[PDB]
Amino acid sequence: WSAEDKHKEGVNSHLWIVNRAIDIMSRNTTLVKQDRVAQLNEWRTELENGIYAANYENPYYDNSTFASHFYDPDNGKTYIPFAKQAKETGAKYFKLAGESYKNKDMKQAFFYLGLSLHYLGDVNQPMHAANFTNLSYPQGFHSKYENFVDTIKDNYKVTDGNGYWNWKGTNPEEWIHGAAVVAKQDYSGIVNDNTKDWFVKAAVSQEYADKWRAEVTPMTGKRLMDAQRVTAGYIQLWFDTYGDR
Ligand SMILES: [Zn+2]
Ligand SMILES: [Zn+2]
Ligand SMILES: [Zn+2]
């Protein structure tokens, strides 16, 4: 997903997903210790820096190839042979974040958590779970899709306190993989002959621009809602793991 501005949700779907996940945690009054939400907000600057940095600097964006932002659950690979994938990478920062947290280095801890959350967010994007890049046919569709998502994301906010608590085991890798499995299933609802066809014809006919945009909205809403719930659960897992217990 997009991460155009470090501190603005308008053009940062990643930040939006995390903020909506935090809201889910705040709405939950039966399981979540609100002191956890207070900590996230206390180091929000470092958290947002991490969410943003993943798409703009090494080693996070893999020399501008973004290889680590992809993960196909069926073969466990990214789109470039032998490159690092989102599962091992997101898990790496989940653990680095916890170690810093236990050593009381809050700035380092939340920066790394932000990075981990970025990768978790990406596998919720069907294209990232199917190795469909901005160079895949139709080329350019990937970036335009993510650009469009920013214009409608606010219509799919989760308004209850039900995150996927303890969704998968205690291994962060399981959550990333699990999210990817669900995302890849919803792939066809976004990339198919119709949307491909219309996206191509959209170059000359605005009428077709509206057609593919409307076509991918339903599945997009479902993916964004799931991403919020899974992210809330992931954050809860992090605190339960490194919050001393
Ligand atoms: Zn992204
Ligand atoms: Zn993308
Ligand atoms: Zn990314």
Tokens representing 97?
A: 């974040």
Cα separation of 155 and 91, whole Å?
Answer: 30
Report CA(34)–ligand 2 centroid distance (Å).
32
Superfamily holding 1-245: P1 Nuclease (1.10.575.10)
Report CA(119)–ligand 1 centroid distance (Å).
7
| DSSP calls for 66-119 | -GGG--BTTTTB-SSTT---HHHHHHHHHHHHHHHHHTT-HHHHHHHHHHHHHH
Report CA(125)–ligand 2 centroid distance (Å).
7
The C-alpha angle with vertex 28 and arms to 23 and 34, in degrees rounded to 5, equals 75
Tokens representing 218?
A: 């339903």
120 within 8 A of 71, measured Cβ to Cβ: no
| Ligand nearest to the CA of residue 144, numbered in listed order | 2
Report CA(31)–ligand 3 centroid distance (Å).
30
Tokens representing 165?
A: 């608590």
What residues flank ion ligand 3 with Cβ within 5 A? 55, 69, 122
Q: Domain residue spans in the chain? A: 1-245
Report CA(133)–ligand 2 centroid distance (Å).
7
| Ligand nearest to the CA of residue 130, numbered in listed order | 2
- 3-state secondary structure (DSSP) of residue 57: coil
Report CA(54)–ligand 1 centroid distance (Å).
9
Report CA(137)–ligand 2 centroid distance (Å).
14
Cα separation of 200 and 140, whole Å?
Answer: 10
| Ligand nearest to the CA of residue 56, numbered in listed order | 3
231 within 8 A of 17, measured Cβ to Cβ: yes
Cα separation of 66 and 83, whole Å?
Answer: 10
| DSSP calls for 144-180 | HHHHHHHHHGGGG---SS---TT-S-S-HHHHHHHHH
The experimental method, as deposited, was X-ray
